[PDB]
């Protein structure tokens, strides 16, 4: 014979008798008592739970919980053996347990720029109880900001409540890193139960943003000639982005390998410094690109001009080219000439010339000995380098003191230290 | 005096001569001749090439390249000392160099679903000519498919055309991932000269594809007390990205501890096996959910529930419990009887218990002496296991040949190799 009664209820409470014909209670001994001579059975100071009993252990779903119990009849007319009954009491489910969340808070990592829509799954909460009694809503509660950005859907594919966060619409971890909410659960009982926990919506970056330089272009002056490791310049970039997504690479972008002999990039600080003799006559400027690129999986890029201009030393010493004109002409350093056509003549055209730049190739320049030659400009312009000159005769002569006449020029630059050069011319007679 | 000559003209073009006025060349000597008596200067079998010239190698653009060049008058009625004149021959382009790509083959990494408008820099194309003889235009040719997923735009910020493809639609790498384009530049000379790279877009992967399991939900039958390392199952997920945005990795999601003790999860492979005693009357069902995950840095996920029965082995012998009914009551295994009412009043109630499945736990039951006690249905059901029998009398009997009765009980299940049980009561008298 069956019988239902409600879990956990108070000490001798009835649970009825008979419905069928001394009483003794053979099984379900803790649980239960019965009474001699009117075979009705009550409960005992061990309540009955549902959610206690090895009896009623992995049941699946709306599988009923019974507890076997045994009771004896010995006595029919003091001659019949005694009859025992099996007996059912269905323990019925009260809604005594909590719906809960297996920690109290529950930590989502979205990424940025989720499209609208996409899902992802909240932990689950549990209910010892069974029915009506367990698990029944979700609901997100949530501040005002963030319930424009969140929404909540409940899945009754897998047979038990997958509940879901559902992006409503864009994240930017740059604008806003993340979030606060609280998932509410409630069982289906009356009164109900409920639980909370704190959802965090932590926005996960991605490499969505570039880097940027300082400055759009870089200048730098550069003396020449500087030594191994002089600081030229420093390029630097900024990026939005987090951890690699925003670690930054410095490397020549559109650099003629001139320029790369001459400097040196280093990839983390983006300094520039000398590697390689800078000659101001070889290259007045150096001008490149440099590339900032990300450390991000697919590397975002920018790009700076640079233009370095270089500094001029005086590194060069002038340069006296002695040559002819018209029908004199010279020979291994010395030319032809025998009394005079006339004084005020030219034998030479001189051409005095400096490579560095404005002072330090400002051209001084004069003539040695204690000679009858001249030098008179040749030039109708100023040229501060490109000096052109005869050198002209003073005083006529004749065959009869001469083939003598080592004429030495001598020149200097406005440099500091200044620096000089000396070149001659034998005149034959 | 000042002259325009065209750069590489044929030998002895004429350059012109005196607006002004022997005449002798001082200066200018490999690109120049002049004539005797006249004064009219022509050209070499040296041709003078613009692009060529020391005197024109960094010149800015729109700097004029100017040859020098030194002419000498040495006859004024022969009286006169000789008259030198500056020169400067202004060499004027033309279009005899074609603009040009470094690399012929051009190649661009462009990230899956970049948005509509993101643009992209091409390699610049150079020509060593000057001014409208130089790079004038860009143009793209391309596949009908590709024609509406990408376009060109220059800019004429950085007064140099920096060419750029803007991305017209989505890329999905899944889809394709790689496109041929060409780039043609093109001088502003006439007529013009070209050049032509191939420009090969490459999408490059990003995460935007998660895991999937090859089936939505796992069942497997694991035969009880298995081996350490004996196969459950193995689950597999499928990525259809690149890479470590496809690799995966497996690990329990929503797994008990009991599971865990119980199974190992490989997480390369995805091959469950047996780390632990399993044991069917512990755990008849093992119930839990894995979770497959990619390698990207934000890790996509997939999760299958996975469910093993757990089939029984004859590992259980029976269990013979013999207890008291009514008024007759045991003691340390044995219980009191004298000058029996009756035959067929019992003396004990007695359950047989199996506690496997089935045929192992289908129990035949048997009592062992030559005594007058048979065991005899008191239930009114037929529960395969639980069986309730009276142990009942046979024969009635006097005090005078009682005191030593060993009732003893077998008990063997249906298994194989099969199972047994003994147990006994004294009834003294
Ligand atoms: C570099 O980046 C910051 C943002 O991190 C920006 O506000 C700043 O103006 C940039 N440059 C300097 C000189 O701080
Ligand atoms: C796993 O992935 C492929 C695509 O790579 C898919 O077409 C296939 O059907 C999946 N499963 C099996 C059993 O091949
Ligand atoms: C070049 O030579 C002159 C002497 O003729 C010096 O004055 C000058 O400093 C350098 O030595
Ligand atoms: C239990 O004991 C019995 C003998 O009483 C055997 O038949 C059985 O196989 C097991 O040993
Ligand atoms: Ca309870
Ligand atoms: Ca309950
Ligand atoms: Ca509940
Ligand atoms: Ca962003
Ligand atoms: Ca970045
Ligand atoms: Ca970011
Ligand atoms: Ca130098
Ligand atoms: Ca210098
Ligand atoms: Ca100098
Ligand atoms: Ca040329
Ligand atoms: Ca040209
Ligand atoms: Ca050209
Ligand atoms: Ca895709
Ligand atoms: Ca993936
Ligand atoms: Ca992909
Ligand atoms: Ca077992
Ligand atoms: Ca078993
Ligand atoms: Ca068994």
């Given at each position: 014979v069956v019988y239902k009664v409600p879990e956990e209820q108070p000490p001798n409470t009835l649970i009825g008798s008979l419905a069928a014909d001394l009483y003794k209670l053979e099984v379900g001994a803790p649980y239960l008592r019965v009474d001699g001579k009117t075979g009705d059975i009550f409960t005992t100071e061990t309540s009955i739970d549902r959610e206690g009993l090895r009896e009623c252990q992995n049941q699946l779903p709306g599988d009923p919980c019974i507890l076997e119990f045994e009771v004896s009849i010995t006595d029919l007319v003091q001659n019949g053996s005694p009859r025992l009954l099996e007996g059912q009491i269905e323990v019925q489910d009260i809604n005594d347990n909590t719906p809960n969340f297996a920690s109290p808070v529950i930590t989502l990592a979205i990424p940025e720029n989720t499209?609208?829509?996409?899902?992802f799954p909240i932990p689950l909460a549990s209910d010892r109880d069974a029915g009506p009694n367990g698990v029944a809503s979700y609901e997100l509660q949530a501040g005002p900001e963030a319930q424009e950005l969140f929404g909540l859907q409940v899945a009754e594919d897998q047979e038990e409540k997958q509940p879901q966060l559902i992006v409503m619409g864009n994240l930017d971890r740059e604008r806003w890193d993340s979030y606060d909410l609280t998932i509410k659960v409630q069982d289906g009982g009356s009164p109900p139960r409920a639980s909370s926990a704190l959802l965090?919506?932590?926005?996960?970056?991605?490499?969505?943003?570039?880097?940027?330089?300082?400055?759009?272009?870089?200048?730098?002056?550069?003396?020449?000639?500087?030594?191994?490791?002089?600081?030229?310049?420093?390029?630097?970039?900024?990026?939005?982005?987090?951890?690699?997504?925003?670690?930054?690479?410095?490397?020549?972008?559109?650099?003629?390998?001139?320029?790369?002999?001459?400097?040196?990039?280093?990839?983390?600080?983006?300094?520039?410094?000398?590697?390689?003799?800078?000659?101001?006559?070889?290259?007045?400027?150096?001008?490149?690109?440099?590339?900032?690129?990300?450390?991000?999986?697919?590397?975002?890029?920018?790009?700076?001009?640079?233009?370095?201009?270089?500094?001029?030393?005086?590194?060069?010493?002038?340069?006296?080219?002695?040559?002819?004109?018209?029908?004199?002409?010279?020979?291994?350093?010395?030319?032809?000439?025998?009394?005079?056509?006339?004084?005020?003549?030219?034998?030479?055209?001189?051409?005095?010339?400096?490579?560095?730049?404005?002072?330090?190739?400002?051209?001084?320049?004069?003539?040695?000995?204690?000679?009858?030659?001249?030098?008179?400009?040749?030039?109708?312009?100023?040229?501060?380098?490109?000096?052109?000159?005869?050198?002209?005769?003073?005083?006529?002569?004749?065959?009869?003191?001469?083939?003598?006449?080592?004429?030495?020029?001598?020149?200097?630059?406005?440099?500091?230290?200044?620096?000089?050069?000396?070149?001659?011319?034998?005149?034959?007679?």
């Open positions: 499209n609208i829509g996409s899902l965090r919506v932590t926005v996960l970056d991605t490499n969505d943003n570039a880097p940027k330089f300082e400055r759009p272009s870089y200048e730098a002056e550069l003396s020449e000639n500087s030594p191994i490791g002089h600081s030229v310049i420093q390029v630097k970039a900024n990026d939005s982005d987090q951890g690699a997504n925003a670690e930054i690479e410095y490397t020549f972008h559109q650099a003629p390998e001139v320029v790369r002999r001459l400097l040196r990039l280093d990839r983390n600080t983006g300094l520039i410094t000398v590697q390689g003799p800078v000659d101001r006559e070889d290259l007045s400027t150096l001008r490149f690109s440099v590339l900032a690129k990300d450390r991000g999986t697919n590397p975002k890029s920018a790009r700076a001009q640079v233009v370095v201009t270089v500094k001029d030393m005086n590194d060069n010493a002038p340069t006296i080219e002695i040559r002819g004109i018209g029908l004199v002409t010279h020979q291994d350093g010395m030319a032809n000439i025998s009394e005079d056509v006339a004084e005020e003549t030219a034998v030479a055209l001189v051409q005095v010339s400096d490579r560095d730049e404005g002072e330090n190739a400002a051209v001084t320049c004069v003539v040695a000995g204690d000679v009858p030659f001249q030098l008179r400009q040749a030039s109708e312009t100023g040229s501060d380098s490109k000096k052109k000159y005869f050198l002209q005769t003073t005083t006529p002569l004749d065959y009869e003191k001469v083939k003598d006449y080592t004429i030495e020029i001598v020149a200097v630059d406005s440099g500091n230290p200044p620096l000089s050069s000396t070149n001659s011319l034998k005149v034959q007679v």
